[PDB]
């Protein structure tokens with residue numbers, strides 16, 4: 190069923206390459222052993238993170254202003270700045286470049302504003318705190334886990350989420 | 357082998373994300389051979405997996421009256437903590453199922469922080485578990501080791517879940533400020549993973565390697581000082597301050613718990629060694645003036661062991677402890693006289709101070725420095741801080757002004773060279789209070805009149821004569837009561853602080869709340 194877990198999903202070439210290679214290498218090894226489960230979990234990780242799955246971006250500025258104004262009473266200046274950022278992104282075609290940053294006294298609405306931004310752009314929200322570890326470990330059974338960004342991709346099952354690097 | 361492990365998964369509710377794991381592992385025992393190392397590795401791995409209490413709880417007592425009774429049985433009046441536990445029960449009962457908080461008690465040594473967790477777990481009917489964290493260097497105690505290693509083991513929290521046979525225990529994590537910070541595996545980060553409600557729902561132990569749901573446990577942390585608790589850890593706890601006790605609280609605690617336990621230990625009953633309550637009051641007053649109760653317990657044990665020696669050495673056959681021969685049992689008193697002046701001369705006035713060992717009572721002596729009644733001066737001694745010297749200057753100016761407006765032909769305080777001293781010259785002292793005390797000292801020196809005898813006053817004064825609030829009203833009132841003051845004077849803006857004190861503290865005190873200094877003058881004369 191692993192092929193079904195990425196059938197309808199658009200896959201690149203050099204990814205299906207490693208997928209088939211690991212399936213053949215897993216047919217080689219013996220099932221239910223200290224060599225089989227490792228490669229099984231790795232091939233699971235290859236077939237879990239999306240490749241062609243997206244989220245239709247919310248480009249409209251009126252809907253964005255509405256979803257920003259619903260929550261977060263006040264903040265009119267931060268709201269104006271966010272609207273202007275979305276306008277520049279819509280006019281530039283993309284959203285890369287500078288990375289936004291909110292700073293101020295504590296308990297003022299800097300995490301919830303990022304959640305509301307994510308809800309605005311219809312991007313899937315994900316937060317990971319940086320208060321090495323963002324790159325994952327290696328498969329010598331020491332760290333059998335990918336990084337937190339790969340887990341973001343798996344969780345949100347969308348290639349364009351909104352990750353929040355809090356604090 | 358398989359039969360017992362699959363039977364053990366009967367009275368539980370095993371979640372799927374671990375039921376498939378235990379099934380995959382069971383599928384290996386049939387293949388492996390009973391002689392191999394992998395066999396025993398997976399055998400005790402399955403032992404650990406099936407021994408975890410996967411869905412069961414305890415019959416948590418959500419009755420409020422019973423919880424209050426069992427809380428008030430074990431300890432004497434730690435109300436700020438019992439109130440929190442009762443509100444926790446009330447909330448956990450309003451919103452349906454059992455809950456889990458992360459509380460932290462901080463305070464001086466010996467106030468009951470660690471001692472109360474067991475009675476709290478008895479009140480909630482939970483399974484109490486405790487482990488100290490001070491001095492801990494490695495994360496393997498919190499996390500554990502990968503079961504690949506030879507003698508791998510789960511760790512303290514999984515062992516707690518196995519030993520309590522429940523997954524809503526009360527885990528007392530003791531000494532969370534003395535936690536070591538060896539960065540080659542930092543235990544503070546494991547403690548953050550434990551005490552972080554957003555992620556403690558999946559506590560991934562390095563041995564189990566399946567997440568456990570630790571969101572229904574009541575973590576309680578104990579600290580002596582909060583300023584060395586890691587900041588991220590401190591930002592996930594409810595700091596509840598367990599303060600010290602006063603003479604009457606200490607007496608109740610002694611009579612109810614400390615003396616009976618010390619009698620059970622030393623083997624003396626009230627027929628052999630009589631510790632009356634007057635002796636205990638004198639002891640608490642002159643020897644044990646700290647915040648906790650460990651020193652008082654040691655003093656009680658001291659008296660009891662000396663009486664025990666008097667009996668065993670065949671000398672007394674019975675020991676009567678009277679307030680006259682207490683020195684023979686405990687030595688020289690630490691605090692003796694409580695006041696330096698019995699009747700105050702025209703110049704000196706009693707003030708009140710704050711200290712960690714209860715309050716204090718200091719006097720403000722003033723004296724003519726040169727022979728006379730070009731302007732007068734003020735020399736100020738007594739190890740005074742900058743704020744206190746400035747407040748003395750302010751009090752001097754206002755005293756000049758007030759004496760000019762009150763008795764315009766006095767000429768004192770203007771042409772006289774005065775020396776102001778706050779005795780006990782060795783100890784340093786600071787604070788904006790005693791401004792009214794200094795004004796009163798100067799005025800009583802200028803008019804040649806001693807103030808009311810049993811009168812004490814605290815309060816900041818401004819240049820126009822307004823009386824401003826001060827701090828430490830509890831200790832100052834305790835000190836004035838202890839020294840035999842009948843009339844106390846406080847700023848009018850400390851009325852709430854004074855009426856917030858326990859009733860026995862302010863029993864026979866005649867308090868006066870003032871706004872300006874003219875009222876203090878009308879009272880002190």
Ligand SMILES: Nc1ncnc2c1ncn2[C@@H]1O[C@H](COP(=O)(O)OP(=O)(O)OP(=O)(O)O)[C@@H](O)[C@H]1O
Nearest residue numbers: 431432464465466467468469470471580609613649
């Ligand atoms: N309010 C109280 N009522 C009854 N007994 C008390 C009270 N406060 C303390 N005790 C007794 O005194 C002892 C206090 O020791 P405890 O373990 O509470 O200290 P602690 O709060 O952990 O301080 P530290 O952690 O700084 O040593 C306990 O044995 C307890 O029985």
Ligand SMILES: *[B]([O])([O])[C]([C][C]([C])[C])[N]C(=O)[C]([C]C1=[C][C]=[C][C]=[C]1)[N]C(=O)C1=[C]N=[C][C]=N1
Nearest residue numbers: 707708709710711716784785786787788789790
């Ligand atoms: B006051 O509240 O400012 C007061 C004035 C005192 C010197 C008559 N100061 C103190 O009580 C200080 C503690 C303090 C409290 C608040 C602010 C600053 C300082 N106490 C002492 O200085 C002291 C001195 N000797 C013995 C005991 N206490």
Ligand SMILES: Nc1ncnc2c1ncn2[C@@H]1O[C@H](COP(=O)(O)OP(=O)(O)O)[C@@H](O)[C@H]1O
Nearest residue numbers: 260261262263264294295296297298299300301
């Ligand atoms: N303008 C606002 N409108 C509504 N809720 C707010 C607003 N500002 C702050 N809050 C609330 O206060 C809390 C702020 O915490 P948060 O902003 O996450 O802390 P930090 O700013 O340190 O990240 C949030 O729970 C948020 O709901």
Ligand SMILES: [Mg+2]
Nearest residue numbers: 469470530578
């Ligand atoms: Mg303790």
